[PDB]
Write a protein that binds this DNA or RNA. Structure first.
Ligand code: ZN
Ligand code: ZN
Ligand code: ZN
Ligand code: ZN
Lengths: 73, 70
DNA sequence: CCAGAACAGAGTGTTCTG
DNA sequence: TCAGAACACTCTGTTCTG
């Protein structure tokens, strides 16, 4: 029955900012939208985002967050 | 004057290849240490001063292909 | 100069709270 | 229920040292 993060496939802690996610992707999304970051993809803007590689490309991670419908209101 | 790994300003010839300091210490730490680097793209990730943190796997790959060794 | 050590920061992830 | 605070850890890069 266990719930899965729609961003990285890790265990989802709950519905955060409109989307079923884990804590890491939650706080990441908050920090990313509000914070001033220089995220730039090194691939083709389609990087695989899972528990191991989510640290690799913050750009694609934020992209998946936004496309999932995450918002702060 | 330019790092053959990320194109940043090269500090000198390290481990056999003209590199900067960051790629020097990165290479040593990567080779000796037990890391779980995994590429999220297609093994052709752009490694420059801005994005070199993104894919350690491809960075290490460029180091090895450059001939770096201990 | 070059190798290695050591110090410091960015980014991240978990725990705790209401 | 979920949002936010805050501490702690990993990885990295510069400075220091032999
Ligand atoms: Zn997640
Ligand atoms: Zn990417
Ligand atoms: Zn370099
Ligand atoms: Zn890569």
């Amino acid at each position: 029955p266990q719930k899965v993060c729609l961003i990285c496939g890790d265990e989802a802690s709950g519905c955060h900012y409109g989307v079923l996610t884990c804590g890491s992707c939650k706080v990441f999304f908050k920090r990313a939208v509000e914070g001033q970051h220089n995220y730039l993809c090194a691939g083709r803007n389609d990087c695989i985002i899972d528990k191991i590689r989510r640290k690799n490309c913050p750009a694609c991670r934020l992209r998946k967050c936004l496309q999932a419908g995450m918002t702060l209101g």
